Amino acid sequence: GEAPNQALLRILKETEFKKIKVLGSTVYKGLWIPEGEKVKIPVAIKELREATSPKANKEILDEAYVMASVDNPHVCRLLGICLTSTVQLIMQLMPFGSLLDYVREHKDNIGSQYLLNWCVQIAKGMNYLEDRRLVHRDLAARNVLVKTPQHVKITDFGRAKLLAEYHAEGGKVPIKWMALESILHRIYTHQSDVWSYGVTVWELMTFGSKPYDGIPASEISSILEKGERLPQPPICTIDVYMIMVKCWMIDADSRPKFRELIIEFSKMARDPQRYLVIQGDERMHLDMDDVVDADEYLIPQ
């Protein structure tokens, strides 16, 4: 009926890695030395809060399921899990944090070529997920992480589902990123992901503004019914903005396909200064001995 998911789940001993410092509240920056190999891998180690909670353990393991089942240069893969007191997820370290934080903090040093390349990379990653019958259901600039300024990946599969639609039943949801059919009828498809892609592109082109800032989430489905959308970002030619606006069409099948968003952003990345107009764009740049990035650490498939 469907393909068997032969993804490897790798179980790692607590001794194979050092937690080096904290990044969040918990996610640690760490180093992973796979046992009996002369490599050290920069890692992020995500460790369950309570660990008392049986609800919590179902959460993290579902994320682990999805992360183990993806392999694409624009999607965060799982390196393994460690079954301790608190279950910890081991993933590739993304040193430059969320792309949302990166645009806010570097808004004066980011050129049209970077912004359009990111739009292509995120599109490629979402196209891969669509290929693998996977709906992310939480695409947002907070959930795109920066390996290098030249290389971003989609992350936080906390809400991702495999398939068709997906009728969910309430919860803590990210309203301002969600398709109308998602807010009204809790329906989610690849095309509801495309809507959030639209909002994601808007976030990047406004250097990390909050969409519908100071509109309460109780208002949002009404505004969107009325036909209002996010405004044209200042740097955006009608060309770019028209693409975001297509992602926000009420008819989900009239929205663009990720594969097409790859194509359209790629044309525009061949001539970035024609499509995004940015003040000063022209002039902008952006033992360790055994260390190897996770992206160069392969095991048999």
Ligand SMILES: */C=C/C(=O)Nc1cc(-c2cn(C)c3ccccc23)ncn1
């Ligand atoms: C490529 C997998 C990956 O997620 N790497 C990664 C993740 C983070 C990260 C994720 N979350 C939810 C965080 C919260 C606070 C600080 C860092 C977080 N960081 C680095 N690499």
